[PDB]
Structures are given as C-alpha cells and as structure tokens.
Amino acid sequence: ALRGTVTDFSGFDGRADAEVLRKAMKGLGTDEDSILNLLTARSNAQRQQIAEEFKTLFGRDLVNDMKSELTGKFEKLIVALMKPSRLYDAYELKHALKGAGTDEKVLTEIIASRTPEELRAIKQAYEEEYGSNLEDDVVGDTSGYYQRMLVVLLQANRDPDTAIDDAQVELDAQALFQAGELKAGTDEEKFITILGTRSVSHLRRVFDKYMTISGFQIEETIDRETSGNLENLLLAVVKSIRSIPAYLAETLYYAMKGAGTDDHTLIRVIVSRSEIDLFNIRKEFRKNFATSLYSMIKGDTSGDYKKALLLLCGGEDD
C-alpha cells in the first residue's frame, strides 16, 4: 500500500560505482555532485554493497572518507543515507538519549509512528549495537506518565486487527469520556492503556464514536486534558493511528514552516522513510498543506544539501 521514493537500481555494479566514488574524492577537492547523484539513486542495500566493494578495492572506509571530504548538512545527509536501514532508527534513538540532554521530540516521533513489528527490530538492532537495552535507556532518561506511555509502546504489544466489536467500541469511547472531560483532573492511566494497547482498526472506530458522544475530537480533549510531553506523545499516537504518513507529512511541514528549518528532522524523516512510505507522505503533504513537499524543501534548503534532498524526495507536484 505504501510507497517510498528510492528503489533498487537496475544496472547495479557495486564495483563500478565504488570506482566513481574514489575519483570523486581523489586529489584536491571533491566532486560532491558525482557523490550525491550516485548515492540518491541506489537503495540502502545497494549503498552497503558499494561501501563493501570500495573497501576491498582500496582498503579505505567509504564513510570515513566521505566524512573527511564533505561538510555541513550535506555531510550529515550523506552519512545518514549510508546508515544501514535496520540500524538508523536505533541510531537516531541512541543519539536522542545519550548526553546531558534527551531529545524527547525524537523519542516521541519514532516510538509513536513505528509499528510493533518495527519496534521489535529496532529494539534488537539497538541492543546488538550499543550493548544496552532500549527500554532501560528510555526509562532512565524520562519520567512521569510520558515515560509510562513510551514503555507501553516499546512492548510492541498492540492488539491485532480483528473484526470490530461495537459494544467494545462503545465501552472504550465512554471510558475515555469518563476518564477526561467528565472528570476533575485526568485518569491518564486509562488513556495510556486504551491508546497504547488496542488495535489500530478498533481505535479508529473509537475516535469517531468518541466524537459522536462528546462533541469533541479525541485530539481536542487530549489538548484540554493534558500538557507537556505526554500531550505531544498522545497526540503523536492518535495522529499515527489515523495515518502514519499524514502524521509524518505534518512533522516535516512544521520542521520547515517555521522560520528557518529543523534540518535534523528533515534529514531523519526523508531518509528513514525513503524506502517505506515517502511517496504517501508526499501525497498527504499536498492535500493538507497545499504545496508539494518538493516546492517546500526547495525553498528552505540549498547547496548540494538541497539537491540531494530534492533528488531523494522528488515529485514536483507533490
């Protein structure tokens, strides 16, 4: 159903490509153009084979060489495209946690939009790489109900998608109604359990039924009922339950919409989704924000950075 914008290259010859990359870096200067035109046109799997060939041909590390030749945002963008798919989210997560500061925005974004299937892989990939337990790192860097919601999510235990049980839809909407609007204060525990564990098809029916019953969209109650990270988290979850692409098209938009740009978010969403559903993200960006993602990246970015990005995203009309 989903569609990314980067696919496997047809006449792939990892050895030929590595040679092109060597030339682009050998001697004085760099042919950034040759680099970017090549790398944004191979799938992540192919980029791993190229790095492999490069090492057996020249005994040099493709990524470490690039880190020496490139600079600024282009570098960061090229370094991210080189990260093996199975490892990127883990890498972004580890980096949001580590340090004297945590980027809850990153924690929220990845954990809420990734499916249980993806969360399990991410958890494995994370432990094998940093020799730490993701849950334990999140738990230690966060607190309150925000932390709880994240753990519930990390269990990747969401119920499966069965035929919808109306009595059950009714029950859950009423429960949410009683846990928030009809209450002085909030029963966050009830929101966490219903939002974090019920199936996706079930919750979509509950969101609607809840509108019917209360006159509010669950999003408005959340905003009325909560604050801080828990609010952002719950909104992210609700948004992703409705449509992950749509939720991501929106975090992309707010990354640029502001004055300058949140390049880390721009890089992270475009790269991480390039081979999953970036095409869908593009479509949702047009519908809801009037302009294609292309036109928007095009005006906020520049340099080879802008060229690579536009080449990865593509679609001038979306």
Residue count, binding to Ca ion (CB under 5 A): 9
Q: Is-contact 271 4, C-beta < 8 A?
A: no
Query: Is 300 one of the binding residues for Ca ion (CB under 5 A)?
Result: yes
Query: Is 71 one of the binding residues for Ca ion (CB under 5 A)?
Result: yes
Comparing CB distances to Ca ion, the nearer of 67 and 204 is 67
Query: Is 172 one of the binding residues for Ca ion (CB under 5 A)?
Result: no
In angstroms, give the least distance from the CB of 56 to Ca ion: 21
Read out DSSP for 127-145?
Answer: HHHHSS-HHHHHHHH--HH
State whether residue 216 is helix, strand or coil. Answer: coil
Looking at 55-63, 125-133, 151-159, 295-303, which segment touches Ca ion (CB under 5 A)? 295-303
Query: Is 178 one of the binding residues for Ca ion (CB under 5 A)?
Result: no
- CA triplet 89, 90, 92: central angle to 5 degrees? 60
- CA triplet 139, 144, 149: central angle to 5 degrees? 70
How far apart (Å, rounded) are the C-alpha atoms in residues 299 and 16? 34
Alpha carbon separation from 43 to 5, 57, 83 (Å, rounded): 10, 21, 11
Looking at 5-13, 144-152, 193-201, 220-228, which segment touches Ca ion (CB under 5 A)? 220-228
Query: Is 183 one of the binding residues for Ca ion (CB under 5 A)?
Result: yes
Comparing CB distances to Ca ion, the nearer of 70 and 97 is 70
Comparing CB distances to Ca ion, the nearer of 129 and 220 is 220
Instruction: For the segment 95-134, give every residue that binds Ca ion (CB under 5 A).
Output: none
In angstroms, give the least distance from the CB of 123 to Ca ion: 30
How far apart (Å, rounded) are the C-alpha atoms in residues 266 and 289? 16
Alpha carbon separation from 181 to 49, 178, 226, 236, 269 (Å, rounded): 55, 6, 11, 20, 34
In angstroms, give the least distance from the CB of 46 to Ca ion: 24
Query: Is 223 one of the binding residues for Ca ion (CB under 5 A)?
Result: yes
Which residues contact Ca ion (rule: CB under 5 A)?
25, 71, 180, 183, 223, 227, 231, 256, 300
